Structure formats: C-alpha cells, structure tokens
Design a binder for these strands. Sequence first.
RNA 1: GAACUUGAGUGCAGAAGAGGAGAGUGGAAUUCCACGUGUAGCGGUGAAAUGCGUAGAGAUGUGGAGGAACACCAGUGGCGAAGGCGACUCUCUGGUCUGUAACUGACGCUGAGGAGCGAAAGCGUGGGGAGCGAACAGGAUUAGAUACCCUGGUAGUCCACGCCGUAAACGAUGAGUGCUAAGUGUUAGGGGGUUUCCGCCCCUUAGUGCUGCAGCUAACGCAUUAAGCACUCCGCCUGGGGAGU
Lengths: 114, 92, 64, 85, 272
Amino acid sequence: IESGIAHIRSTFNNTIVTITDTHGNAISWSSAGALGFRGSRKSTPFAAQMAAETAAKGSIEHGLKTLEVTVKGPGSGREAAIRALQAAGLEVTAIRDVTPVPHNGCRPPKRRRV
Amino acid sequence: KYEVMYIIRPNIDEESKKAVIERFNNVLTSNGAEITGTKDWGKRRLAYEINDFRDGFYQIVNVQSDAAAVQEFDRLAKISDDIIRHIVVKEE
Amino acid sequence: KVCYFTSNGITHIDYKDVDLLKKFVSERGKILPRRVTGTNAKYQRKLTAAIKRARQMALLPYVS
Amino acid sequence: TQERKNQLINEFKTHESDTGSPEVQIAILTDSINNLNEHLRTHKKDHHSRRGLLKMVGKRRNLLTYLRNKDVTRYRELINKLGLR
Amino acid sequence: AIKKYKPTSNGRRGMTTSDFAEITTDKPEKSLLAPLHKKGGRNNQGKLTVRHQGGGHKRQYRVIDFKRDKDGIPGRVATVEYDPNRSANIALINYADGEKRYILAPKGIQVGTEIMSGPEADIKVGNALPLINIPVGTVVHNIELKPGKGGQLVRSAGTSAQVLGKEGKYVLVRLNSGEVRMILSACRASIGQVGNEQHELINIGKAGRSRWKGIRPTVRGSVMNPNDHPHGGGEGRAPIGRKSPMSPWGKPTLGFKTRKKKNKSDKFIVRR
RNA sequence: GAACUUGAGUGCAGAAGAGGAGAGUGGAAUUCCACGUGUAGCGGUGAAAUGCGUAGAGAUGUGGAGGAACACCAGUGGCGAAGGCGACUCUCUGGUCUGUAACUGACGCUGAGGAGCGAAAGCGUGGGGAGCGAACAGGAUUAGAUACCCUGGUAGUCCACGCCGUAAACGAUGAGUGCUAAGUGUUAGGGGGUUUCCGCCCCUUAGUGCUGCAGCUAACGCAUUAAGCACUCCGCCUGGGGAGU
C-alpha cells in the first residue's frame, strides 16, 4: 500500500509509534521499550527517534510512503519522532496535534505529594 | 412567542417531507399556537454527525402560543424518527 | 480593539447568523476570548449564549 | 401578571390615583403570596422563593399593623374583603 | 404511599401497610370475576410439590387482559382497584362499546384517561403498542414473548423495562434484573412503569400477616433430621457441615446456576 | 389630633444576572463490551516492582452500554442573607439595580427567645456506580513505614425523600443610617455637549478592585466597600491550662 497515518503517542513514560492504515489498520508498530530502553530512557527523545526509525523501516517494508502523522499524549519525544519519520525515507505531510482533551468529564487522580 | 427550529432527516421524499411539516404544524395547532412565520434553510451539512448523518433539512416555525403545545412538540419530536433535531427558543 | 456590536448597532445576535458566529469562533471551534475579538462584556455574553445554542443544532462545530 | 395587579388596584382603590394606599398594596401582596404558595406546594425544595415569601409576609404584616393603628374600620373591611384572618 | 402504624403492641412494632390511596372503589364487577380454589401447593397427584404455601384469606380471581386484543377502540379508566391475585393494582377500563376490561395499573394513571391500544396508537402511559412502533428508550411493561399470546415479561408492581434499540424481526429490551433480550418485534407491550412502587417497602409485622397471604412457615434444614434434609442432624446447632449449602434434594444452592445448558433461547439473550 | 415628603413602600418603564426548583437534550473524554489490524510489550517510578499481556494486551479503527462533570466563554465578572451557584432548552418562581414622578405618608431600624436555610463528611430507606477513592490488599522505600510513592479497590462521591446542623461557615471585620480629600480600572444603568452614527468628553447612580489625605491603630495596616467621626440595636470578651472537659 502507499498511504497510511502514523499514530505517535508520546507520554512521560513511553513514546509508542504505530503506523496504521487510513481506515485504521496497523501495518507495523514499535515503541521506545521495544527498541530495548527499559528505564526512564523510554521518555527521552532519542528513544522516540529510534522507535520512529524502526516503525519507518517496517512501514517501508510493507511499502507505504506518504504518512499523515497524529501526535497524541503529553511527553517529550514528539518533535524528534516527526523529524525521524522524515529522515528515514517517508513524507510527513499533515501534523495532527491531537491529545485527548476531555471537556470536564471524570475527575483526575489525586495530586502527588499529598 | 417561540422560534421552533428543527432538523428533518434528509433521506425523505418531498411529499412525505411536506407531510412531516404538516404533521408538526397540526400538532402546534392543537393549542391555538399560531404560526407567525416559516423558513426552510434546506439541506445543510451538519458540523458533526447526529445519528448517522452528515446533513439534514432545517425548519424554522415561529409560534405565538401559551407554552403547552410547544411541550407537545417536544415530546412528539423526541419520538418521531423522521427528525434529527429540535430546539424551541423563547423569542425575547 | 473595537467592539463589533457597538459599531454596527446590532442587537440580539440571532443564532441564524451562522457566518458572524463563525467569525468570532476560533479555528478549532472554541469561542475566542474578549481580549482577542475586542467586544464588550455584555456582547460577549450574548455571543457565547448564541454559540452554545448554534452548537447544539450543529450550525457550529464543537471540535476540529 | 397585569390582570391580577390591575384588577386588585381597581378593586382596592380608595382614591382614583391609589397605587400606593396600603389596601391596594396588601391586596397585591396577598395574591402574590397565594401564587407563590401554590408554586411552593408544587416545588417544596425551593427555599430562596420561600425566603422571598417570608419577606412578603413581613411586608404585609407591617402594613396590616399600620392600618390597625391608622384606621380601624378600614382595617376590618380589608380583612373581610381579602379573607386575611 | 405507605401507612406506618404506631407500636400499640408487640405485633405492630415495625408493621407498615400501604395507605391504599390509588384505590377508588372496593367493589369489583361480577361480570369479570372468576373463582379461585386454593391449592396448598398440592398437585394432580395430591402430593405437596411446592412447600410453604396454602391457607390464606380466600381470594376471587379477576380476569385481566394481558393480550390487549382490542385495537383502535379508545378506552377510559373507570376505576383503579385492589387485586389480591397480584402485587400491583388493576385498572378497570370502559371502552366505547361496553367491553369492560381489567388491565394493569401503570404508575401515575388516573381515572378518566384515554387508552388506545392499536398498532398506530399514541405513545402514552397506558397505551399498548407492538415493539415495532415503540421508540427506543421508553419505559415499557406487559411485554409478551409470543405475539397474540398475552403479556409475560414486566408485569408486577413498580417494575419497568426499556427498548434498547431494534435490529429486524427482533427488539433489544432491558428486562428487570438487567437482562438484555431479543424480543420478537410483533409482540405488543404496554408503556410505562407499573403502579404500586411502594409494595416493596412494606414491613409485614406479624407472623400472621404473611399467613393471611397464604405463606406457611419455613423450617431451616439445619434444624431437621438427616433423613429430611442434608443439613439435618448434628448434636446442637451444627454448621453447614457439607461443602456447598444444599436444598432438601441433591442440588447445591448458593451460586449454582440451574438454567438448562441447551436452553433454546440463549440465542435471544444478549446480556444477563 | 391635624399636616409634610426626604426615610420606607406601592405604581409605571426598562436592564442585567452560574438566584432557585422540575423535566428534557447535547459534545468531548474516561471505563467496559464485541469485531478487524498485529506483535511483544504496556503501565508506572527518584530507581524499580506489584499489576495488565501470546488465552493476544497497550496502540489503532468502528459500534454499543453506562455514569458523572460541564473545556473554550472565564474576568479582583455577575447573582444570592449565608451556605453557595458555571453545557443547553423550556415550565414555574425569588430578589436586585436604574429613571422618575403617579400614589401612601413614618408604614421605619434592630431583634433575645422562636421558625427556617445551612459546604463537606456522616446516618436511614430505595436506586446508581464511569472516573476517583477512605478502609483494606499487594509492591516499593525505610532502622521501622499501620505513611508519602506505585498498583488495586470497599463505603462514599451521584439521585429521591427524611435526619445531622457542623467548618480557617473568613472580610478571621453584626445589621441599619448619616457625614469625612483625591487618583484609577471595571459591571449593570441614566442624562448632557457636536455628530443620524462610529465614538470621545462631561455628569450621576448602585455594585465591584487597587493606590492613596485627614482621621484611627500597639504595629501590620484600614481609609467613602473604614479599621475614621457619630447615633440605634443585637451578639460576644474579661489571663493560660484543665476544657469546650
């Protein structure tokens, strides 16, 4: 196939990249923990870069070329992973900054130092 | 006084759509709720889907009533399946 | 800035005016605050009431 | 609104210009207390409207004591008209 | 609502009844009555096949349409009366013709209201539509499983169901105890709650007020002998000495599901 | 006893408000459920581990169930006596402010006792349960760790009615009224000086911020929204503990 959408979800622990197909069918997936980083290095943007590199290699192994990349989750490695999708042979056209915004919804778990 | 704006679902033929508007106007005439003005926006593309639909027909019915058959309109439009929306706004 | 509704003298905003509400609403769908559009307090109140009613009839979006 | 107050004015006028004149005013208070109290019989969990009704009862009671100390026969005829007993 | 008694004696300490304010008349009609022979739990064979029953006040049966046969002919509630045969009250309705019929009493129905029952009737508390015509999410009772048979499913006091959507020849209904069942869409059901709704909040009080309803006492199996029950025996308040607390026959009771494994209508049960 | 209209209130005219109560509806998101994609992790941390996961998870796409809060507006903004009140819509309903002049003509203020409201937790009955979460369990940390952290999770949070009647219930500032420099934002009004306007300026209310003179105060500070200068009324204090026993 040629077109898919790259769902990156980079949160304070993990930066999970799944390259899926446009009506949502995952071609290949690789995370920051799949690359081997087990510790807090999962949060570092080097692991997000590496995870995007491996997902990009698997996506070119199945053959898709023009992505449409959706950044989700509050973390740190979003920019390096978008940059690493570019430098690994793919095109990043649109950038969907879609973190899940509740309007008011459920109440969060308690603040931490209390 | 009320502005009664509702969305008829699109997959409906034109004489049947006239029968829908005649139905809910017959419901409003159960009061004496005079119909002081009508307007059809027509097929508008909804900003988000309602039941399954991207689009729907709009009907604006201006009413001068005694606030009862408006509530009969509310219950009959929450039940009739050939309607996507309704609001009744107190025109003040 | 300058208020819209004081300039054009227009009163109750009439939810049917979807293009005017679409001017005040931001790109994603949010209501722009008063320090961006420059309106009054009162006119921002009638604007937000208008936008919420027009959202519930899908004349305006929620999320984009 | 606007048949109740206007009929109570025209019923309890002692002069033509009377919209004050505590008999007009007590009668408006009685029928407004009665509409409010039927609302409270529907909605028992409304308390802010009860606070307003207690203020109305205080207004009307003080106007009644003013009529009692001002004009005895007018006070008794108002009581017998409104049934406020 | 509920009449609470004063503790004038030890028999009426916690006792509550209902105040019976929904009821208008205490006369039922002779044209609709039928006799009830009490059975005492006994059988064709004469053996006690149901325990703990028999011997209450004498009752006389009131015939009730659970079918809603009469379509398109408007009804009118004449009375709302007491039924001893069931938990709810019953509404005696007059049609225009003169077929006086008992139906169940929904919660909030009053004397003098229109009750249509056809396929094309109005949706209102008291009316009875097939499940094709009923919209999704309306409170529904007197559901039936076979069309034309008569109301089966939600039928006792203060009970309610709801149409959870449609697919086809069937209708998703959330019956009481939360069970989602496919019900054949040509089955008529009435619309609403059922109308005691405080029957559950009745403290019976005496030992004898339950016996007025035809309830014999229940002996626990732990007090019995070992020939009578598997809990019987033990030399002075023995516990359930077996694993799996058992019935007076050979079946465990707590948790043990007794539905047939090849029940033919598990295909029509969505959630349970 | 007679008169008056300023105080008080009715009348008329607008204005604004998350003021209340009942019903209905919405869109995110969260959880759970079913199915496709697909493979080895996910989650979480200061570091990890418990949990979840090849019986196919987390990610992702669609559908459904259900509950609760209502992003942006949103603001020393508004309303309410206080508690408090934020989606939307209707039903009923309370109060306020502004302009007077039509009326009343002192009808006013305060108020022990009484009657009511009264956050949250708690209690009773019946529902409800998505998230959270006392208790409780496991994992960490630690000398110990009945804690903080992590993973789970009961009552409760939610609703109907009834009870409790308590808060750092705060402005740590009782209510009413009058007087006593200014500057300055702002909320809802009114009127004027040119302009039909946009709008600028001036003027006046009632509410709401800040800085500030006199005055007060032990000082911090308050200062026309007083903690000034007065009058009325109520509540309360007379060292700390014991003891709100």
